[PDB]
Amino acid sequence: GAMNSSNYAELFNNDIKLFVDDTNVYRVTVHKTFEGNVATKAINGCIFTLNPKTGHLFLKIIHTSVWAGQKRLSQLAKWKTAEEVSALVRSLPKEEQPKQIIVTRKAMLDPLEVHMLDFPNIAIRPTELRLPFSAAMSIDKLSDVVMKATEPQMVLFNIYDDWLDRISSYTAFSRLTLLLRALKTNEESAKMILLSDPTITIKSYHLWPSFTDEQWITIESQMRDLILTEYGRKYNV
Amino acid sequence: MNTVPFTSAPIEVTIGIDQYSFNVKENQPFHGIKDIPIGHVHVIHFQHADNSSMRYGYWFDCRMGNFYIQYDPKDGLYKMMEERDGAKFENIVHNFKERQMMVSYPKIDEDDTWYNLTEFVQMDKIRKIVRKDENQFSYVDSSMTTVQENELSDPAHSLNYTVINFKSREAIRPGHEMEDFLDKSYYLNTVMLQGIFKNSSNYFGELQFAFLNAMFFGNYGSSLQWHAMIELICSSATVPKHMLDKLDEILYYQIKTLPEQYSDILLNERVWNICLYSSFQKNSLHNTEKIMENKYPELL
Numbered sequence: 001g002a003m004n005s006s007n008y009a010e011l012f013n014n015d016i017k018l019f020v021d022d023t024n025v026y027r028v029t030v031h032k033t034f035e036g037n038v039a040t041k042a043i044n045g046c047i048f049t050l051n052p053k054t055g056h057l058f059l060k061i062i063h064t065s066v067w068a069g070q071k072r073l074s075q076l077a078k079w080k081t082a083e084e085v086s087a088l089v090r091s092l093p094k095e096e097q098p099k100q101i102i103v104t105r106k107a108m109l110d111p112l113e114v115h116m117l118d119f120p121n122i123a124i125r126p127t128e129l130r131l132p133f134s135a136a137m138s139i140d141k142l143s144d145v146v147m148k149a150t151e152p153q154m155v156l157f158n159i160y161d162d163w164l165d166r167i168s169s170y171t172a173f174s175r176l177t178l179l180l181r182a183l184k185t186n187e188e189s190a191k192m193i194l195l196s197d198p199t200i201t202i203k204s205y206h207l208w209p210s211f212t213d214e215q216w217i218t219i220e221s222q223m224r225d226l227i228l229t230e231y232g233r234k235y236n237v
Numbered sequence: 238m239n240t241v242p243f244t245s246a247p248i249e250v251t252i253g254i255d256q257y258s259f260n261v262k263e264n265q266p267f268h269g270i271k272d273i274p275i276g277h278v279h280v281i282h283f284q285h286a287d288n289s290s291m292r293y294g295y296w297f298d299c300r301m302g303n304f305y306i307q308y309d310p311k312d313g314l315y316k317m318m319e320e321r322d323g324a325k326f327e328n329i330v331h332n333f334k335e336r337q338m339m340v341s342y343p344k345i346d347e348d349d350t351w352y353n354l355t356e357f358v359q360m361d362k363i364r365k366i367v368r369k370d371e372n373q374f375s376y377v378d379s380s381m382t383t384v385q386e387n388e389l390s391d392p393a394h395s396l397n398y399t400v401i402n403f404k405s406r407e408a409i410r411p412g413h414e415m416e417d418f419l420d421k422s423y424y425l426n427t428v429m430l431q432g433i434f435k436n437s438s439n440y441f442g443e444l445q446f447a448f449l450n451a452m453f454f455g456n457y458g459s460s461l462q463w464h465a466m467i468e469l470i471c472s473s474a475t476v477p478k479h480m481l482d483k484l485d486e487i488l489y490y491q492i493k494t495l496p497e498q499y500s501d502i503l504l505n506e507r508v509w510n511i512c513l514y515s516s517f518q519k520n521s522l523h524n525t526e527k528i529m530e531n532k533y534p535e536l537l
């Protein structure tokens with residue numbers, strides 16, 4: 001069934017599962033034509049497929065050439081997402097295949113179910129959580145590899161860096177969703193928070209800065225402030 | 238003109254014969270139904286006055302045998318039976334005819350309703366959906382489940398309709414996932430028509446039989462089958478033109494005959510709105526769309 005606040009700890013048990021977010025698969029800029037009509041220009045996109053227990057991120061880069069000559073691209077994007085997720089599952093050894101795939105948008109349910117008919121025992125589930133994975137393209141290293149791609153490519157990351165050496169996967173996911181929610185609500189401010197102090201750097205093999213335990217508590221507090229504010233600045237409260 | 242005689246009517250019952258019905262009182266001198274048109278299947282059906290639970294009945298074709306009804310006080314129902322002795326049966330029917338103890342099948346000469354509802358329905362196909370090979374007629378009731386319902390429990394008492402499932406390997410060619418899901422023409426024309434049903438007449442026959450079981454017995458799984466068979470055609474971009482024209486006629490007469498007060502439970506809002514307004518065939522069912530809009534605009 002659907003994944004919600006009530007069954008949240010299920011994400012961190014030992015049954016392999018993946019979140020799939022398709023919100024950055026089909027990306028466009030909207031512009032005027034010489035004749036004054038409007039047109040779109042696609043830019044490279046990505047499927048965000050994340051194991052929330054381990055942090056493993058399978059970032060499938062969607063190169064704009066996949067849309068060439070195709071119609072109804074927003075519908076096709078859901079099916080292309082499901083095709084790529086099914087291909088990923090088939091590429092993994094049996095003992096690494098997920099028992100459940102949780103889609104962040106309900107419109108992905110039928111495309112993924114149809115593509116996964118060969119895997120009757122993999123449950124395809126929606127969620128009632130409003131997860132902020134669309135903000136993944138605000139992580140500089142992820143945006144950079146997507147924008148530089150000249151062909152379809154899969155790139156593997158650990159979205160938790162080395163956090164699991166010191167914190168649990170529940171705590172790591174909570175930090176990740178807080179950071180992403182902040183980046184989604186006010187990207188400029190969130191990024192200022194994360195980089196303001198130049199003595200804290202991002203390792204070459206990491207996505208986020210090398211904060212101490214104490215600095216993460218401060219950072220996390222700054223992100224919560226940002227989110228509540230914007231929630232005021234927005235609703236005036 | 239054929240006759241379905243009755244040994245007696247010991248319990249008060251509403252008896253249906255095709256789209257007609259009449260009330261029979263407990264121990265009323267009723268001895269059956271005469272003047273039944275030859276050339277069609279027929280259904281004789283029953284609802285007891287004391288237990289409107291379980292509508293039940295029998296599909297038959299009088300060309301296949303001499304059939305009669307006798308109430309069984311042990312099993313508590315009117316049972317159809319076959320009399321192998323033709324002279325004895327003709328003699329009994331003649332005696333009852335002379336004593337005017339039979340109702341006449343009350344067909345209006347201008348009226349093609351029953352033909353139109355059973356055009357493609359064949360007794361041999363009914364007997365494959367309802368498996369009871371020792372009898373030439375077929376029992377159906379309100380509670381019988383379908384093979385597909387059982388998969389999701391007694392197999393001998395099941396309705397063996399052709400399983401249709403839009404999210405199944407049968408329906409979806411590997412590598413054509415999006416194409417086959419959004420345009421079901423492959424599944425309709427190759428899998429179902431060429432492969433399973435063999436021709437559109439057999440497909441329409443099963444569609445018509447499912448509707449009739451839904452209408453006359455409130456059989457829920459039959460309603461599901463009827464709607465699935467409609468949706469499979471409407472969700473196919475490529476359908477033979479003669480099938481679309483025939484489907485429009487089939488559905489028109491089904492909607493025309495449906496009791497106005499049963500539309501709430503026997504019509505699926507999603508399927509009908511999709512079929513008439515969103516599907517590939519939204520502009521191909523003119524007669525059905527017109528009768529639906531004038532008789533059940535609320536559903537739409």
Ligand SMILES: Cc1cccc(C)c1NS(C)(=O)=O
Nearest residue numbers: 242243244305320325326329
């Ligand atoms: C109705 C009837 C018609 C035809 C054949 C049989 C055996 C019967 N039953 S009876 C003779 O009443 O008991």
